[PDB]
């Protein structure tokens, strides 16, 4: 005998694969990262699915490349995912 699914309290495995708008309560699939410029190590807050080209305030250097989702960060830069709240 196995556990029967509950519609009001979905399991972790069931809810993890759901589409962001098909979940029980919708939520963002994106986040923010703290990214250090590989030139002078200045730290800027960039967005995961950033469609614009992010320049550092000091280096004036591209820090990300737009794609069809989850913009690609420049080579040689460190990034840390900031907490959601």
């Amino acid at each position: 005998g196995f556990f029967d699914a509950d519609l009001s309290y979905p399991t972790v495995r069931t809810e993890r694969m759901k589409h962001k708008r098909r979940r029980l309560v919708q939520g963002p699939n994106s986040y923010f990262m703290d990214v250090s410029c590989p030139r002078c190590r200045q730290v800027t807050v960039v967005y995961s699915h950033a469609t614009t080209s992010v320049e550092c305030k000091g280096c004036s250097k591209k820090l990300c490349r737009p794609t069809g989702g989850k913009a690609l960060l420049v080579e040689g830069c460190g990034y840390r995912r900031k907490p959601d709240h």
């Binding site: 005998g1 196995f2 556990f3 029967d4």
Partner: protein, 88 residues
């Protein structure tokens, strides 16, 4: 008891049909697929005793193929089955 009654109080129903224990549906006299499963009770030791627990399942559940799932659910509800293995 259970059934349709007069204002005089006498039971009027010809008979009281069995109800499926999974979906709560009256088991008709013509479906010919409904089963009656009796699980023997067990004492503190391994030997069974006289008492048994009875399950009724409607024929359409078996036709659909959900009879096994329904029986698992009913047995876990009655406490006959263990839903998960204990901690090591």
């Amino acid at each position: 008891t259970i059934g349709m009654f007069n204002e005089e109080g006498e039971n009027v129903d010809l008979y009281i049909p069995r109800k499926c224990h999974a979906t709560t549906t009256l088991i008709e006299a013509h479906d010919h697929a409904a089963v009656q499963i009796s699980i023997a009770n067990v004492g503190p030791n391994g030997v069974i005793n006289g008492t048994t627990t009875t399950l009724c399942i409607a024929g359409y559940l078996r036709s659909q193929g959900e009879s096994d799932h329904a029986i698992n659910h009913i047995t876990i509800d009655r406490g006959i089955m263990r839903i998960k293995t204990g901690k090591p």
